[PDB]
Scaffold this active site. Sequence first.
Site, mmCIF file in Angstrom:
data_model
loop_
_atom_site.group_PDB
_atom_site.id
_atom_site.type_symbol
_atom_site.label_atom_id
_atom_site.label_comp_id
_atom_site.label_asym_id
_atom_site.label_seq_id
_atom_site.Cartn_x
_atom_site.Cartn_y
_atom_site.Cartn_z
ATOM 1 N N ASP A 6 0.875 -1.052 0.119
ATOM 2 C CA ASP A 6 0.042 -0.135 -0.187
ATOM 3 C C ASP A 6 0.832 1.223 0.004
ATOM 4 O O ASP A 6 1.318 1.750 1.022
ATOM 5 C CB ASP A 6 -0.937 -0.209 1.200
ATOM 6 N N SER B 4 -0.638 15.510 -12.207
ATOM 7 C CA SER B 4 -0.745 15.304 -13.613
ATOM 8 C C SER B 4 -1.188 16.227 -14.269
ATOM 9 O O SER B 4 -1.600 17.379 -13.881
ATOM 10 C CB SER B 4 -1.861 14.286 -13.553
#
Length: 330
Positions: A35, A199
């Site tokens: 994770d 992004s």
Amino acid sequence: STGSATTTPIDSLDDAYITPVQIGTPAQTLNLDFDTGSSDLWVFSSETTASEVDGQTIYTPSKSTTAKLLSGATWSISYGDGSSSSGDVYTDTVSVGGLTVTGQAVESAKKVSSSFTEDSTIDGLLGLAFSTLNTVSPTQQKTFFDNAKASLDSPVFTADLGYHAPGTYNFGFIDTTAYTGSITYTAVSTKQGFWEWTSTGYAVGSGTFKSTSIDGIADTGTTLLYLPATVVSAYWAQVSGAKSSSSVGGYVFPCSATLPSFTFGVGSARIVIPGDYIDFGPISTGSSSCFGGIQSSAGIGINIFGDVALKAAFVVFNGATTPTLGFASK
């Protein structure tokens, strides 16, 4: 040193991925959910409330000659999906894919919430976010990667998750045969303890690319892709009959649909998520309403590039003095 381990989807939907981890002496192998959105290595154990164990493999520290109670240390964690767990702490030897850390904090669960009990395939979590998020008190503990870093050939790990298929976690090296083209690296903020990046935009299907900054986290422990409501609406508007369902808890779409791809930007590069990766199947057994793999982050507080996005790429988690993320097509 290096390590390399195969990671396997827990079910036919890729709801999560499990990676075998050796703990203790002699080794006890548990299948952990790696994770990159959390920083605790915790396991089902001989200490876990018996009624909360249902098919998981447990760690038994009393059977490990290298286990030592970390005296006074406790842990307690709550995840974004509302699940939680807590317990006490041992140190022990932990190996992943041939890479060994001695003295790793292994957090032994005394209590786990219902969703953990109900998932017999996940024996615990191995956190790979920054150690500043580790919950052990009163002495915070380091992640497996942080402990291994100095020994690794290069201070990196890579995630290569498969679509409906196994993939690989590598530590200490970048397998240049595992991706196509070049790796595009992008800046990371560690201020929230995550692999947080920006992004450069998105496209839906064959549509034109929209240049827009989207801050979010690379999180292997989250199944889906969670993005701003504007972006998510633009995606699902291209699917006839798709709608946001308050009763189901997100966007659903007719199971008869063919989904468009979704592209996200990494600098000037582009990662394409095929439409099929966005199908999470019937909302309930036998339903013709299917659950979408791109969902709104509006109720979270952060955008999450979960498995839906990451499995479309070869992803480098670069733990150099200034961390960065790398993405390549594959």
